[PDB]
Amino acid sequence: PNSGTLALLLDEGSKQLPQAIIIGVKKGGTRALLEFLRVHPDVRAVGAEPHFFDRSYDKGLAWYRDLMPRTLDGQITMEKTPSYFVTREAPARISAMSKDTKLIVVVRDPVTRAISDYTQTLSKRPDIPTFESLTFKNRTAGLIDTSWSAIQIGIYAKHLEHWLRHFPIRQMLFVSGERLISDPAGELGRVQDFLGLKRIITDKHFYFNKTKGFPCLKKAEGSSRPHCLGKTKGRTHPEIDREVVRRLREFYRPFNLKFYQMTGHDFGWDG
Amino acid sequence: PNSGTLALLLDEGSKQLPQAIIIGVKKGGTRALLEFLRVHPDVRAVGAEPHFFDRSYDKGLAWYRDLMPRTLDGQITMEKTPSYFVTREAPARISAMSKDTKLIVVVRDPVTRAISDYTQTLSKRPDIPTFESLTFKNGLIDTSWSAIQIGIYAKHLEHWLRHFPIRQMLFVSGERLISDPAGELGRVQDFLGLKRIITDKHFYFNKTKGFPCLKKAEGSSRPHCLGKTKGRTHPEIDREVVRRLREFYRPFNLKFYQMTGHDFGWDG
Numbered sequence: 175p176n177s178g179t180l181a182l183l184l185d186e187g188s189k190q191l192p193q194a195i196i197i198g199v200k201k202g203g204t205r206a207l208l209e210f211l212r213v214h215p216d217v218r219a220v221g222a223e224p225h226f227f228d229r230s231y232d233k234g235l236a237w238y239r240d241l242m243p244r245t246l247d248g249q250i251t252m253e254k255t256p257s258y259f260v261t262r263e264a265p266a267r268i269s270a271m272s273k274d275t276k277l278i279v280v281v282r283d284p285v286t287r288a289i290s291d292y293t294q295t296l297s298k299r300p301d302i303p304t305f306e307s308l309t310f311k312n313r314t315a316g317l318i319d320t321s322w323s324a325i326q327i328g329i330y331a332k333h334l335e336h337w338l339r340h341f342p343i344r345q346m347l348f349v350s351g352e353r354l355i356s357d358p359a360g361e362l363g364r365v366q367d368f369l370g371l372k373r374i375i376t377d378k379h380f381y382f383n384k385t386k387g388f389p390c391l392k393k394a395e396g397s398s399r400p401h402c403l404g405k406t407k408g409r410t411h412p413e414i415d416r417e418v419v420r421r422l423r424e425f426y427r428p429f430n431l432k433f434y435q436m437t438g439h440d441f442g443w444d445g
Numbered sequence: 446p447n448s449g450t451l452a453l454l455l456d457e458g459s460k461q462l463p464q465a466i467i468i469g470v471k472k473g474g475t476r477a478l479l480e481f482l483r484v485h486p487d488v489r490a491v492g493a494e495p496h497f498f499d500r501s502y503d504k505g506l507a508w509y510r511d512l513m514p515r516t517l518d519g520q521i522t523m524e525k526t527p528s529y530f531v532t533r534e535a536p537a538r539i540s541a542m543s544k545d546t547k548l549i550v551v552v553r554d555p556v557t558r559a560i561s562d563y564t565q566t567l568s569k570r571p572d573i574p575t576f577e578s579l580t581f582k583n584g585l586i587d588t589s590w591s592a593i594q595i596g597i598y599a600k601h602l603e604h605w606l607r608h609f610p611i612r613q614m615l616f617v618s619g620e621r622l623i624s625d626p627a628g629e630l631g632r633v634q635d636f637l638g639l640k641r642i643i644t645d646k647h648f649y650f651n652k653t654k655g656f657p658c659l660k661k662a663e664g665s666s667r668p669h670c671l672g673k674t675k676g677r678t679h680p681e682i683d684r685e686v687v688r689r690l691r692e693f694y695r696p697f698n699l700k701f702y703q704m705t706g707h708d709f710g711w712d713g
């Protein structure tokens with residue numbers, strides 16, 4: 175950065191509390207959304223997940239504001255912390271910072287999200303029981319263990335009720351994790367509209383990596399070369415017992431249908 | 446860059462010869478044009494000015510292609526060397542590489558271009574004579590002075606048209622690049638066959654510097670204004686000298702407008 179540029183930021187740039195936050199969900203495709211959004215000239219985001227509203231609230235809003243990137247007028251300041259979605263005091267705390275805060279939730283088929291979550295935990299703690307084992311409280315009775323975080327996070331409808339007690343539905347956007355993969359430019363169109371940004375991100379910003387199997391950015395923010403998400407993003411899932419899968423799809427179905435109605439959109443996880 | 450990404454470039458990436466080149470003009474606003482164009486995801490450009498077709502031609506084509514960035518299918522490879530425009534041998538040589546090469550020329554009011562050129566020379570050698578002194582040979586203007594000769598666009602253009610069809614050339618307005626960046630960039634993207642991505646939101650006007658800056662540069666998440674060397678303060682020039690130079694260029698300017706089919710408005 176040259177003298178004049180730094181000078182501009184020093185003189186006309188300021189640190190703002192985030193006007194929009196990606197609050198969830200874990201494994202929904204939150205890193206992908208944030209990286210794609212960063213391509214837009216009017217988006218500036220914190221690199222790390224702050225975990226302010228859940229883990230470090232006692233440090234204060236001043237500390238939080240301090241983590242934010244210095245922006246120019248017109249640019250939107252954002253942060254993502256997937257765990258907020260299921261944090262009890264989060265809705266109240268964010269509303270306390272500002273009642274007009276916009277919230278983005280990247281959702282995904284509860285079944286594949288649960289398996290994705292498990293896969294990640296398995297890579298960290300390789301000696302844990304199987305997915306089938308953790309899924310049930312009682313296998314033959316078919317009684318699922320809803321206290322297990324992996325299952326719990328996927329009951330979107332219930333968590334959403336918690337948020338709607340502090341925010342109007344109009345201030346929330348529900349992004350399709352599946353479409354973010356099959357047609358990112360398409361999904362980003364909706365996100366840009368929601369954030370009040372001009373639709374700049376388009377098909378030409380993406381390049382499909384056959385080797386990885388997911389789309390990548392033809393040119394990443396702050397770089398001239400492409401950018402595919404790392405090995406940690408797009409982990410291979412273990413094969414799960416067909417019956418266990420049918421049972422979990424059965425468990426989520428009613429909650430999914432409620433979620434479709436609450437959001438006014440059928441995400442297609444139940445056909 | 447991470448493993449997966451880097452692997453992708455090594456496997457699917459490849460160096461190409463430039464399909465489009467910014468060939469001029471000196472002080473027209475070439476750095477600004479290239480820096481703005483680099484924001485496009487389908488554009489990859491050489492960082493330095495090659496000076497292949499003019500200065501280092503004897504280094505062979507191998508050396509040239511070496512400097513090119515590794516691109517992905519669909520991405521256009523580009524370079525800028527402002528002095529190509531006035532290089533006699535440039536037209537034939539570039540055509541030899543490929544007669545399908547697209548050429549972009551950023552033009553500027555010949556008078557302000559001349560003063561800008563002088564100002565740059567002055568920054569490198571503060572002891573040179575005044576601009577007014579160098580302008581005249583005797584009311585006879587010293588047309589042999591590079592600062593003046595470079596501005597006779599029509600003359601140089603005739604040389605290029607002996608090797609390229611006018612449709613493979615685009616003349617960008619240096620003045621509009623400043624007043625309406627997105628406007629000129631739109632013309633450029635269309636000419637290069639690239640989708641129109643660069644828009645008004647990509648720019649932020651710097652009141653302190655007096656020029657627009659990129660809100661987000663290609664190689665950064667932060668804004669980017671051109672350096673202190675781009676947008677130099679010009680010395681105050683005698684009105685009579687300015688009048689005589691404008692009168693000198695006018696005939697040539699109007700011819701240039703007819704050749705390119707565009708009135709750049711340097712004479713109204």
Ligand SMILES: Nc1ncnc2c1ncn2[C@@H]1O[C@H](COP(=O)(O)O)[C@@H](OP(=O)(O)O)[C@H]1O
Nearest residue numbers: 201202203204205206290388389403407408409
């Ligand atoms: N272009 C992309 N590259 C990699 N992963 C992507 C992606 N678009 C979406 N994803 C998804 O993002 C998930 C991770 O979400 P988060 O970033 O919120 O943790 C990955 O889960 P898997 O690893 O199970 O495939 C993957 O499915």
Ligand SMILES: Nc1ncnc2c1ncn2[C@@H]1O[C@H](COP(=O)(O)O)[C@@H](OP(=O)(O)O)[C@H]1O
Nearest residue numbers: 472473474475476477561656657671675676677
């Ligand atoms: N955004 C921008 N910032 C700075 N200079 C810019 C600019 N857009 C156009 N220019 C012009 O680009 C000229 C330099 O052209 P080049 O890069 O081809 O040498 C400058 O000449 P001055 O220094 O006389 O103002 C300036 O007028």
